[PDB]
């Protein structure tokens, strides 16, 4: 038909890439919708669903936590945020990070494979007179 | 920085003050975006979005 | 000394040796997925730099 190349990349991974007929997205100003051959524009987009129409009329829906929209000559990419951003929510995360540092305090990393293995390793290694039993230099 | 399975290299890169890419900066084209709020406002957001992506990767 | 306990001592080192081997193997499997999400992190950043460098011109 007439189609342009869409790119919906997150900071963490690529979420979409392919030819599309059109996309609809909640722009900061209002209901925004890009059709093939739209004028170059750079805009922020609010959190919420984005409707996509892959070539051949197929439709896809994707929740974006907001981000940046960039249309340019023969290419349009959506640089999505991985979580709702905002000066209010940000200062919250910043204050938290500052606090956690003012008070050395434990926090579990996810890995259990390393957990129970490092523990067994610690118990098995411990209290062996091994280095003494053999005659070793060090 | 991960070179290969048996070689990792301790690296200290400078992010912000943006460095200095000839690749992304030297060339330019006729067209130009129409920024909704001032482009100055976006150049700021993008700059912060970028520095975070740097730290993440 | 004492063959009695040098055994359990040996068996002990045998065990830890068997554990560190398992860790090696596990970190091995974890290893491939690690490089994948390392690669998936590249597009967002490099695209954004082109936009910056461009609009940074003026």
Plain-language structure description:
This is part of a larger assembly, with one copy of chain A (138 residues) and two copies of chain B. In chain A, a hairpin with a 3-residue loop joins strand 1 (4-10) and strand 2 (14-27). By secondary structure, chain A is an alpha+beta fold. Chain A is built from three helices and seven strands. Chain A has helices spanning 87-102, 113-125, 130-133; strands at residues 4-10, 14-27, 31-34, 41-54, 59-64, 67-72, 75-80. With 57 residues, chain B is an alpha+beta fold. Chain B is 39% helix and 12% strand. In chain B, strand 1 and strand 2 form a beta hairpin. Chains in contact: A-B, A-C, B-C. Chain A binds chain C through residues 7, 9-14, 42, 70, 77, 79, 113-114, 117-118, 120-121, 124-125, 128-130, 133, and chain C through 1, 6, 9, 12-13, 15-16, 19-20, 22-23, 26, 37, 40-41, 43-45, 47-48, 51, 55.
Q: Can you tag this structure with a few keywords?
A:
part of a larger assembly, 3 chains, A: ATP Synthase, domain 1, 2 domains, B: 57 residues, alpha+beta, two-stranded antiparallel ribbon
């Amino acid at each position: 038909a007439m189609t342009y190349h869409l790119d919906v990349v997150s900071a963490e991974q690529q979420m979409f890439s392919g030819l599309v007929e059109k996309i609809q997205v909640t722009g900061s100003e209002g209901e925004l919708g890009i059709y093939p051959g739209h004028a170059p524009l750079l805009t922020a987009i609010k959190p919420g669903m984005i409707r996509i129409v892959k070539q051949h009329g197929h439709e896809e829906f994707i929740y974006l936590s907001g981000g940046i929209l960039e249309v340019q000559p023969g290419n349009v990419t959506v640089l999505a945020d991985t979580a709702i951003r905002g000066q209010d929510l940000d200062e919250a995360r910043a204050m938290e990070a500052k606090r956690k540092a003012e008070e050395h305090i434990s926090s579990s990393h996810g890995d259990v494979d390393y957990a129970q293995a490092s523990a067994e390793l610690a118990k098995a290694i411990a209290q062996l007179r091994v280095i003494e039993l053999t005659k070793k230099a060090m | 920085k991960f070179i290969n399975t048996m070689s990792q290299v301790p690296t200290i890169s400078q992010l912000l003050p943006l460095p200095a890419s000839d690749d992304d900066d030297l060339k330019h084209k006729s067209w130009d975006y129409l920024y909704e709020p001032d482009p100055k406002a976006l150049l700021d957001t993008l700059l912060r979005r970028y520095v975070e992506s740097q730290v993440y990767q | 000394a004492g063959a009695k306990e040098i055994r359990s001592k040996i068996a002990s080192v045998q065990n830890t040796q068997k554990i560190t081997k398992a860790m090696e193997m596990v970190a091995a499997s974890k290893m491939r997925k690690s490089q994948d999400r390392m690669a998936a992190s590249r597009p967002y950043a490099e695209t954004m730099r082109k936009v910056i460098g461009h609009l940074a011109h003026g």
